[PDB]
Amino acid sequence: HGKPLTEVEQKAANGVFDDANVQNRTLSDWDGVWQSVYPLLQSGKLDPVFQKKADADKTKTFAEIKDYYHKGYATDIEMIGIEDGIVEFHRNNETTSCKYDYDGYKILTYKSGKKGVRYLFECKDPESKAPKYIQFSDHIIAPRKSSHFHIFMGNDSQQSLLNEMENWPTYYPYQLSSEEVVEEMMSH
Ligand SMILES: [Zn+2]
């Protein structure tokens, strides 16, 4: 399940790192078949996660937490498959795909002061119907296989996506059982 993170990596994941620490990554870091976690939230299976967080965070109610993740996870792209430079999106019973080109990364500084890195990709295949712009965010700032990721998709501009803060379709390995998904969110 991937090597334990170093102190640096753990800090980075927690939004603490300096620009010089950030490095470029390849689309292969996200290779695999991924499932959207939105269904688990709609089914109530993620409730134990929000229950735990609410008991731990006296300033947040269960509803506030679940609502945060509700806005965050919402999506109709149930599955995402990534292989050999091609990202494919499954919305309902229809698929779109593009051989995305890497456009680099962007380091964002959040209103709370914490930081995070977005890895940008762009679709330049005119026949494609997939999103023109996409961004991966997974609490990682240097080459390493992702364990789960948040993806931003759009057709206007990369800046537009950088402006997004509430919706972020989240994906975990398709092979991962639902019980393991809950464990990972609660255990980290
Ligand atoms: Zn995350």
The first and second tokens of residue 146, run together, are 């992702």
If you search the block for the tokens 């620009």, which residue do you land on? 19
Separation of CA 132 and ligand 1 centre (Å): 23
User: Taking a C-beta distance cutoff of 8 angstroms, is the pair 148, 30 a contact?
Assistant: no
Q: CA distances (Å), 1 to each of 4, 31, 177, in order?
A: 9, 15, 14
DSSP state letter for 46: T
From 71, 61, 62, select the one nearest 166 (Cα to Cα).
71
Whether 1 has a binding-site annotation, put simply, is no
Q: Note the resolution in Å, 1 decimal.
A: 1.7
The first and second tokens of residue 51, run together, are 């229950």
From 132, 108, 88, select the one nearest 22 (Cα to Cα).
108
DSSP state letter for 176: S
CB neighbour class for 41 (10 Å; exposed up to 12, middle 13-18, buried from 19): buried
Helix (H, G, I), strand (E, B) or coil at 6: coil
Residues contacting 183, CB < 8 A, separation 6+: none
Separation of CA 126 and ligand 1 centre (Å): 32
From 43, 41, 37, select the one nearest 65 (Cα to Cα).
41
**Which amino acid is present at 54?**
A
Identify the structural domains of the chain with CATH numbers, from first to last: 1-188 (2.40.128.20)
Reported as type and span, the H/E element at residue 42 is helix 38-43
Whether 139 has a binding-site annotation, put simply, is yes
**Which amino acid is present at 146?**
S
Whether 184 has a binding-site annotation, put simply, is yes
From 143, 140, 136, select the one nearest 161 (Cα to Cα).
136
Reported as type and span, the H/E element at residue 186 is helix 178-187
